[PDB]
Design a protein around this ligand. Structure first.
Ligand SMILES: [Mg+2]
Ligand SMILES: [Mg+2]
Ligand SMILES: [Mg+2]
Ligand SMILES: [Mg+2]
Ligand SMILES: [Mg+2]
Ligand SMILES: [Mg+2]
Ligand SMILES: [Mg+2]
Ligand SMILES: [Mg+2]
Lengths: 196, 222, 198, 118, 235, 204, 246, 242, 240
């Protein structure tokens, strides 16, 4: 898995590869790793598929209840719910989650909840087995307040590298753009990203 | 075991081989691995046999009750959600691996479920020890917009790959076709390419061959 | 292993049980009675893990004695043995199983037949002309396969038993300090105290 | 819910009415000899055509050396006899001695008492 | 579950009162078998008599009961009784002695009399059974949880009337066929109805065939009641 | 260690023309030591036969349990349980102990009293149903039995012939198993009658 | 409130069970009639507003593919009893024997649910009587009444609620043991007309049968030992067809 | 006797037990809350029963989390019971969702809890009315909650013995200042309104307690009004009484 | 017999009957109509006290993304019912993987009401609940539940003290039009029809602050602000 969320000028973008493996067999080559927990709050999952799905479902349930009663939840609130589940169940969970969201007061925000259940607010985040190979690349090319077009390019290049070096990553690059304008789903095929 | 699911233009088909094994021994040469969750939602299982049948009957039973309670046809997403939540609760201990397919008022659906409670969606899937042989056929011949006929052929062919090349699969092909307009059609022993040849000899014994010590009538009645 | 033998002749069931109690390197006692009377016509011998053995025997005894008083009646040997089996079958899947093997000998007054049951700690029950628990069986079953007759008197049975005990004194590696022999017939339960010389 | 409570005069009405039920029961008597005790009871005359073989008799063995009889609600008596028999077996099991008659009485009496404040 | 100033149990007394309005059930014990006969309360042409079981229930292969009172209450108790029988069979590998079964059911009834503040069961039973200890046996239990053994007995309506009639004509050395006759005559004489017809009866025997050794329960099918009602001469 | 191997034993059942057969060995052992030569492993509840192999304590228990459950069934339903229904009851009863199972291999044989259809089935220790129409095999000599039956079997055998086949299958499979044999019993089951035969066999 | 609310009165009466039976008497008439090859259960849809849509409220319910029910008395009490009857069919029977319960046994379970509301602490009895009609392999067709006390009885034909005494009379005259299903449906429509005030058509009347297997209602083909439900609710138009040839 | 148990509806659909609970409130000391342009003000009357009561010491206004004030009239313990619950309810929220509880969220929490005590006959309704509020993500809010569990938002609120005077004075402010009211004005006015409403109970002396939660005057935290600000507000109420 | 939900000798449940009486204590009327592809609920909004914040006075609730609920009854019991419904709708989605239908939520809330009807220790809630949505299977939908645990589907309906006025008004419209919904394509027109027929039936004119409006369309249920309503009042004042 290679997953990332990047904040930019108008919001935030989530990207991921589409490969799921058991050992060296590719169980699914077109997985959707980008998961909606609310209209404009999404997460990328890594670790145990079972764990992360079950967690994602519970958060989605909590935030639907939240909306019924209290209105629109902040991205921080979403991250808090994820943390709670991951922390309190750290013994039986192998889950690493990146939470990304758009919100009118707060613009684009990114939180990462790595394996211990800790929370970290960041301008951008990378995770999954494929991420190790792009720490240098990402640290070098990321700037704050990038345009949409620039941001789409940064994720595309980053994940093509991660895909190139990690056998656990591959397939297509999916992205979700989160802005005041709405929700935009992107996809990029190998023949585009391999030749960068 | 080889099980496949293949989506087509107006529905979804599932197929399976018919071999049951206790280690290297073939126990049943023709069991049915295609099970009904509801009339238009079927599934095939691989892994612990008792588990897949049980998790199928439990959830089938709850789905009936849900349908009666809500006055609506069962949805495949409900079969999925229930199965995945149940399997998850047991942390892998219920060794059920399932391809679940069906038609409901929202359209047609194909899913895979793994024993720890994770799910996948797709247009074509396979599970079982015959998994890779069948997937090799699927990856070769699947296209978007298959007709009913093409999809049956494709799925049938994928099960054959498993039958011929996987020691874990054999005997016959069962198919079930779930088209959006219609009733679901279960096609038991749709293909039978593994007929036992006539034996060279007959082993029926001359009567009296067995030595008997003691004999008596058994009372059944009361 | 403690020695636990039973043989049913024509009109009685004979039980013999080793007298030794050994912990580690020392023989603590050479006169142990590995038996409890359950009812006037039913006797139970036992062998297995140290504390469990007596604890189980007395528990069963308490329960059968309770039944006798509640019903002013004596349960058949078949019923007592079914009851015992069930208790063992329960315990095998419990947190701490009873590790006890038992022989049950009884005289059924309603049928006028003697009866011998062998039940291991798993709740495996079988009814037999003769039986043993532990290593004893490895010698004694073949002896009795050879020497046993269904029509034997109580005294023939004791001679046959004498032969079993002689064999075990010869071939078995542990000193089990002889047996206590008990006969169960129509007149109840009696102890043969003359087995040191017959 | 409390059913047995104190009255203004200091009586526990439900216990007092329990005594009334005894008063209504068939008569039982016991006298002790110099080397024995005899227990005698009367048989009711509401309906007859009884099978005496099988009808629960009024004197009960609690153990091989101790008997119990009663007057009052027949059904109520069965509960006491059962607990008494169980306690007798349990006493043999833990003290390796059958109960004394005083011990057994103190036991039944305590069960009776317990039902007046629960 | 409380005492009256006379030392009586209100709710139990009132339950007994309820029972005296229920159809009469009669049990007679002969030397070679037992009879159970009962009158069905309130009938209609449209009632399905063939597939009906409101007063006579099989507890086990060797034990049956006749019911007087609330049918729904009785079904609760019958079911616990059927279970108790199988626990006993599983524990001891023997069919449960009749008294043991009766004593358990009575104890459950007694319980509702002493704790919980739930109403008692509005039910009285006649138990018909055989075992190898006491042979044929008849018992009775009522909402108090008291139980007694009898050579002949009745429950429900007109017990007093039926009790006197049975006392009159019962004789120890009776045979079952004679006891069948006795039970039907007694119901016939105590009915609050015009006449005693087959469609107002339940009937059952427990017989130990002489050319056998084991015991058979016969629950009379309506047709056979009609026949036996003619044989004994009540057409 | 392996509970399925401690005591020993085999059961086999076959179908024929308007009949079924079920057979078992008589051995009860404790590893190498043979303890009883009278341990039968076939039971019946009305007209439904059940053979059980495996840990002998569990064999006994499950017999007692299915007597219990079928007795109640008969009282409530006012008819004897049929083979198809019983198969289901065995299955769900086993699966109820999923994570602490009984160490047994049950085999069910009978004729449906309404349809007259011959019926057999088998289960694994947790209730998975093997529904095959020809033969079902179980126990420490299951491989041997599978071999014998696959070779010896033909459909639509007459009761008198089905008897020879099943007996031969059992005897020869037993003789290649150290933990089976010591005597054998065979049931020939028809709508109207059931015959029981004790076979003569090697006492080693 | 952990004590019984249904107690015995000095006369031996169980007050709340009587009072519940009174509630049933006030309810809209329903009936059931048993033929040789079927059973019909029927009732009136007494709608509470002409602004209400009467099909969104069924008084006739499937309990199992071969068992249906109808009631008289308090509707909401019926609704929950149906939910619990459906569940108990599964938890106490189908999950055990892999088939649906015979009619008598399911009725027996529903009766038990009602009986308990008659004895448990802090509850009132159910205010309904149900008629339950079904088929099963070994008992054939059957019809049962169940009362708030938990009693049940088998009927060849019966009626409950408002006009029950007159309707029981009209049935007692008209019933015989040679009735085909179509005839029983006829008799059911007639009997129901006497007790129905307003409009009498396929929109105000509710009929279901327990008849032949309906393979078109199964939902799938392929398995031939499975033939379809015997419970069928007649449509508005099927009802009207039988009224014009009245 | 339709008024022996709580969960009992009267034939007209009323709950007499709740109606009687209100009498306990009316019987209580007077308290008020005023919603200003960017905050809320709470004020209450403390009856000086005796010289022996220590001044400034029997605090009545209670804080919940850091941003909410609660004041009540009726049975004091009942109000404490309710604030304890409010505190658990606010912590549980913060624990899961990380943000401090919004005032309407908190309102309904108290609301649902109070209503629960009118569903069962083994319980009595609360014998208080509570005035509460604070600042959250989107403004100031003021609430009043009655023994039935009824609550609504307010521009101004009053309860207890002096309720009617206070409401009349409150109504005036709403008319004279449609634009808004500065947090310091609202404090001064609160001291006035409590002073005016005191006359309905003039036979005993009283001590005044004020607290506030303003975005600009307290950073959106609840703080007690103390020293200089309290004295200046008192002097205002004194001067404006004549 | 009059204090708890046990039967009276006439077979009645008095506490249930008294709970229906509570439903009118607020003296508010409400009505609901189905459009071609929407559903509209209107309720009167009365703000007697000048000290109240008008914005927090509401008897319309957003239960889920798709379901709205109007309540006729005192607010505390109303909010108790709203919370449960919200929770029940969230749970359904989680367990069964689709949005809870209007009718199913209704059946569920009715089932809970039945329980209060049967168990001695719970009092019924003094409220009538009207549920609206555009169901994905059934189209625009109105389902109403009461303290008896009764519920049904409606073509249109009305609730409150002056319930009958409005009912007969609509009853007459549907006698005329012969169909079972308002034959209009935009929800703005269906909201107008609804306000119009409330005016005729109740014989009152409404300002923007006297009304409260909820609209359910495919995949959203929402409520109108004062200003959305004002735009609706102006529009009606050009045929009328
Ligand atoms: Mg790669
Ligand atoms: Mg193969
Ligand atoms: Mg094997
Ligand atoms: Mg061998
Ligand atoms: Mg050998
Ligand atoms: Mg006011
Ligand atoms: Mg209450
Ligand atoms: Mg209630």
């Amino acid at each position: 898995t290679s997953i990332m969320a990047v904040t930019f000028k108008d919001g935030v973008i989530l990207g991921a590869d589409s490969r799921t493996t058991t050992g060296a067999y590719i169980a699914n080559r077109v997985t959707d790793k980008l998961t909606r927990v609310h209209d404009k709050i999404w997460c990328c999952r890594s670790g145990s598929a079972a764990d992360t799905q079950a967690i994602a479902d519970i958060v989605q349930y909590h935030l639907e209840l939240y909306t019924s009663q209290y209105g629109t939840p902040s991205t921080e609130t979403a991250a808090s719910v994820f943390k709670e589940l991951c922390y309190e169940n750290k013994d039986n969970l192998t889950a690493g989650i990146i939470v990304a969201g758009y919100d009118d007061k707060n613009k684009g925000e990114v939180y990462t909840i790595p394996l211990g259940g800790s929370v970290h607010k960041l301008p951008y985040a990378i995770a999954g087995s494929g991420s190790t190979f792009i720490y240098g690349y990402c640290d070098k090319n990321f700037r704050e307040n990038m345009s949409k077009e620039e941001t789409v390019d940064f994720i595309k290049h980053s994940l093509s590298q991660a895909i190139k070096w990690d056998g656990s990553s591959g397939g297509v690059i999916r992205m979700v753009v989160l802005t005041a304008a709405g929700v935009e789903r992107l996809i990029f095929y190998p023949d585009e990203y391999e030749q960068l | 075991t080889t099980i496949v699911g293949v989506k087509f233009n107006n529905g979804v088909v599932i197929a399976a081989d018919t071999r049951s094994t206790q280690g290297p021994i073939v126990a049943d040469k023709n069991c049915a691995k295609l099970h009904r969750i509801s009339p238009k939602i079927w599934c095939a299982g691989a892994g612990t046999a008792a588990d897949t049948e049980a998790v199928t009957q439990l959830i089938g039973s709850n789905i009936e009750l849900h349908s009666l309670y809500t006055s609506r046809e069962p949805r495949v997403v409900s079969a999925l959600q229930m199965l995945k939540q149940h399997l998850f609760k047991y942390q892998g201990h219920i060794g059920a691996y399932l391809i679940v397919a069906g038609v409901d008022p929202t359209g047609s659906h194909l899913f895979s479920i793994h024993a720890h409670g994770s799910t996948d969606v797709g247009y074509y899937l396979s599970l079982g020890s015959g998994s890779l042989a069948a997937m090799a056929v699927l990856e070769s011949h699947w296209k978007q917009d298959l007709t009913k006929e093409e999809a049956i052929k494709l799925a049938s062919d994928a099960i054959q790959a498993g039958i011929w090349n996987d020691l874990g699969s054999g005997s016959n092909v069962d198919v079930c076709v779930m088209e959006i307009g219609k009733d679901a059609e279960y096609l038991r022993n749709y293909l039978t390419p593994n007929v036992r040849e006539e034996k060279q000899k007959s082993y029926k014994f001359p009567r009296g061959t067995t030595a008997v010590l003691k004999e008596s009538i058994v009372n059944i009645c009361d | 292993m403690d020695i636990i033998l039973g043989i049913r002749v024509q009109d009685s069931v004979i039980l013999a049980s080793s007298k030794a109690v050994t912990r580690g390197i020392s023989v603590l006692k050479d006169s142990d009675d590995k038996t409890r009377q359950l009812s006037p016509h039913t006797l139970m011998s036992f062998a297995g893990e140290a504390g469990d053995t007596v604890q189980f025997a007395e528990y069963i005894q308490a329960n059968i004695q309770l039944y006798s008083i509640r019903e002013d009646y004596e349960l058949s040997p078949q019923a007592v043995s079914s009851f015992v089996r069930q208790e063992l079958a329960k315990s095998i899947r419990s947190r701490r199983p009873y590790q006890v093997n038992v022989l049950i000998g009884g005289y059924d007054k309603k049928k006028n037949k003697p009866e011998l049951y062998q039940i291991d700690y798993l709740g495996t029950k079988v009814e037999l002309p003769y039986g043993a628990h532990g290593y004893s069986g490895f010698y004694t079953f073949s002896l009795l396969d050879h020497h046993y007759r269904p029509d034997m008197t109580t005294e023939e049975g004791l001679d046959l038993l004498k032969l079993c005990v002689q064999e075990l004194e010869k071939r078995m590696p542990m000193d089990f300090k002889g047996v206590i022999v008990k006969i169960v017939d129509k007149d109840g339960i009696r102890q043969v105290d003359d087995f040191q010389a017959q | 819910r409390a059913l047995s409570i104190f009255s203004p005069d200091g009586h526990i009405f439900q216990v007092e009415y329990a005594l009334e039920a005894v008063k209504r029961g068939t008569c039982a008597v016991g006298v002790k000899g110099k080397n024995c005790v005899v227990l005698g009871c009367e048989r009711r005359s509401t309906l007859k055509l009884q099978d005496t073989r099988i009808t629960p008799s009024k004197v009960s063995k609690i153990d091989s050396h101790v008997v119990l009889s009663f007057s009052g609600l027949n059904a109520d008596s069965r509960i006491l006899i059962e607990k008494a028999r169980v306690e007798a077996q349990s006493h043999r099991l833990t003290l390796e001695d059958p109960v004394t008659v005083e011990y057994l009485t103190r036991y039944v009496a305590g069960v009776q008492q317990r039902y007046t404040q629960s | 579950t409380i005492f009256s100033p006379e030392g009586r149990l209100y709710q139990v007394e009132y339950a007994l009162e309820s029972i005296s309005h229920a159809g009469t059930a009669i049990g007679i014990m002969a030397s070679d078998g037992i009879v159970l006969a009962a009158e069905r309360k309130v009938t209609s042409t449209l009632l399905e008599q063939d597939t009906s079981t409101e007063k006579l229930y099989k507890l086990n292969d060797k034990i049956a009961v006749a019911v007087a009172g609330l049918t729904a209450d009785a079904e609760i108790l019958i079911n616990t009784a059927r279970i108790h029988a199988q626990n006993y069979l599983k524990t001891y590998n023997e069919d449960i002695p009749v008294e043991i079964l009766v004593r358990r059911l009575s104890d459950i009834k007694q319980g509702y009399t002493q704790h919980g503040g739930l109403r008692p069961f509005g039910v009285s039973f006649i138990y018909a059974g055989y075992d190898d200890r006491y042979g044929y046996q008849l018992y009775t239990s009522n909402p108090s949880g008291n139980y007694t053994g009898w050579k002949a007995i009745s429950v429900g309506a007109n017990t007093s009337a039926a009790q006197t009639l049975l006392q009159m004509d019962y004789k120890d050395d009776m045979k079952v066929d004679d006891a069948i006759e006795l039970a039907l005559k007694t119901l016939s004489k105590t009915t609050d109805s015009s006449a005693l017809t087959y469609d107002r009866l339940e009937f059952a025997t427990i017989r130990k065939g002489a050319n056998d050794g084991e015991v058979y329960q016969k629950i009379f099918k309506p047709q056979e009641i009609k026949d036996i009602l003619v044989k004994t001469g009540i057409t | 260690s392996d509970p399925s191997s401690i005591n020993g034993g085999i059961v086999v059942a076959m179908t024929g023309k308007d009949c079924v057969a079920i057979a078992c060995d008589l051995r009860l052992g404790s590893q190498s030591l043979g303890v009883s030569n009278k341990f039968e492993k076939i039971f019946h509840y009305g007209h439904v036969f059940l053979g059980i192999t495996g840990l002998a304590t569990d064999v006994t228990t499950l017999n007692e349990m299915f007597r219990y459950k079928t007795n109640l069934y008969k009282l409530k339903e006012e008819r004897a349980i049929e083979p198809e229904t019983f198969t289901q009851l065995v299955s769900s009863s086993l699966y109820e102990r999923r994570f602490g199972p009984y160490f047994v291999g049950p085999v069910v044989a009978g004729i449906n009293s309404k349809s007259g259809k011959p019926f057999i089935a088998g289960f694994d220790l947790i209730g998975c149903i093997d529904e095959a129409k020809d033969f079902i095999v179980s126990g420490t000599a299951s491989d041997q039995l599978f071999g014998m039956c696959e070779s010896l079997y033909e459909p639509n055998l007459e009761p008198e012939d089905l008897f020879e086949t099943i007996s031969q299958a059992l005897l020869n499979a037993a003789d290649r198993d150290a933990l089976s044999g010591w005597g054998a019993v065979v049931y020939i089951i028809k709508k109207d009658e059931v015959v029981k035969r004790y076979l003569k066999m090697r006492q080693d | 409130y952990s004590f019984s609310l249904t107690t015995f009165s000095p006369s031996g009466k169980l007050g709340q069970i009587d009072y519940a039976l009174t509630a049933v008497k006030q309810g809209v008439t329903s009936l059931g009639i048993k033929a040789t090859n079927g059973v019909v259960i029927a009732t009136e849809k007494k709608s509470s507003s002409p602004l209400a849509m009467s099909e969104t409220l069924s008084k006739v319910s499937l309990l199992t593919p071969d068992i249906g029910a109808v009631y008289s008395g308090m509707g909401p009490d019926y609704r929950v009893l149906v939910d619990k009857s459906r569940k108990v069919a599964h938890t106490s029977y189908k999950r055990i024997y892999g088939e649906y319960p015979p009619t008598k046994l399911l009725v027996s379970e529903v009766a038990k649910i009602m009986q308990e509301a008659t004895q448990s602490g802090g509850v009132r009895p159910f205010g309904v009587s149900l008629l339950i009609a079904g088929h099963d392999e070994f008992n054939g067709f059957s019809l049962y009444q169940v009362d708030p006390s938990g009693s049940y009885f088998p009927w060849k034909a019966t009626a409950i609620g408002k006009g029950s005494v007159a309707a029981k009379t009209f049935l007692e005259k008209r019933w015989n043991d040679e009735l085909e299903l179509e005839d029983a449906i006829h008799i059911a429509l007639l009997t129901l007309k006497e007790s129905v005030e307003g409009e009498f058509n396929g929109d105000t009347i509710e009929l279901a049968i327990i008849g032949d297997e309906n393979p078109d209602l199964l939902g799938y083909t392929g398995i031939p030992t499975d033939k379809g439900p015997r419970f069928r609710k007649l449509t508005s138009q099927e009802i009207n067809d039988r009224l014009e040839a009245l | 006797g339709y008024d022996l148990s709580n969960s009992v509806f009267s034939p007209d659909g009323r709950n007499f037990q709740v109606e009687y609970a209100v009498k306990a409130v009316e019987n209580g000391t007077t308290s008020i809350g005023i919603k200003c342009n960017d905050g809320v003000v709470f004020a209450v009357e403390k009856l000086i029963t005796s010289k022996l009561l220590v001044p400034q010491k029997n605090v009545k206004i209670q804080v919940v989390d850091r941003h909410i004030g609660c004041v009540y009239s009726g049975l004091i313990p009942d109000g404490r019971h309710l604030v304890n619950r409010g505190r658990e309810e606010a912590a549980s929220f913060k624990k899961l969702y990380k943000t401090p509880i919004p005032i309407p969220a908190f309102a309904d929490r108290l609301g649902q809890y109070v209503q629960a005590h009118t569903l069962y006959n083994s319980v009595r309704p609360f014998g208080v009315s509570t005035i509460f509020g604070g600042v959250d993500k989107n403004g100031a809010h003021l609430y009043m909650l009655e023994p039935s569990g009824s609550y609504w938002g307010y521009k101004g609120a009053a309860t207890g013995k002096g309720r009617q005077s206070a409401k009349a004075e409150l109504e005036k402010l709403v008319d004279h200042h449609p634009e808004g009211l500065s947090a310091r004005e609202a404090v001064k006015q609160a001291a006035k309104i409590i002073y005016l409403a005191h006359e309905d109970n003039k036979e005993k002396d009283f001590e005044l307690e004020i607290s506030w939660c303003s975005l600009s005057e307290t950073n959106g935290l609840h703080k007690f009004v103390k020293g200089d600000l309290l004295q200046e507000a008192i002097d205002f109420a004194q001067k404006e009484i004549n | 017999d009059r204090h708890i939900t046990i039967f009276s000798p006439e077979g009645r449940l008095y506490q249930v009957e008294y709970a229906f009486k509570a439903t009118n204590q607020t003296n508010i009327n409400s009505l609901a109509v189905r459009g071609k592809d929407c559903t509209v609920v209107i309720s009167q909004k009365k703000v007697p006290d000048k000290l109240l914040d008008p914005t927090t006075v509401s008897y319309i609730f957003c239960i889920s993304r798709t379901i709205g609920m109007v309540v006729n009854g005192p607010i505390p019991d109303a909010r108790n019912a709203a919370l449960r419904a919200k929770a029940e709708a969230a749970e359904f989605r989680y367990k069964y993987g689709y949005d809870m239908p209007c009718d199913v939520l209704a059946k569920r809330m009715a089932n809970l009401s039945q329980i209060y009807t049967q168990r001695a220790y719970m009092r019924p809630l003094g409220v009538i609940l009207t549920f609206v949505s555009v169901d994905e299977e059934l189209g625009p939908s109105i389902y109403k539940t009461d303290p008896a645990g009764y519920y049904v589907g409606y073509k249109a309906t009305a609730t409150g003290p002056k319930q009958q006025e409005i009912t007969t008004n609509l009853e007459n419209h549907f006698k005329k039009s012969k169909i079972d919904h308002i034959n209009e394509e935009s929800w703005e027109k269906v909201v107008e029809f609804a306000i119009t027929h409330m005016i005729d039936a109740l014989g009152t004119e409404f300002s923007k602050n006297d009304l409260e409006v909820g609209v359910a369309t495919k995949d959203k249920f929402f409520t109108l602000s004062a200003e959305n309503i004002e735009e609706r009042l102006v529009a009606i004042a050009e045929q009328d």
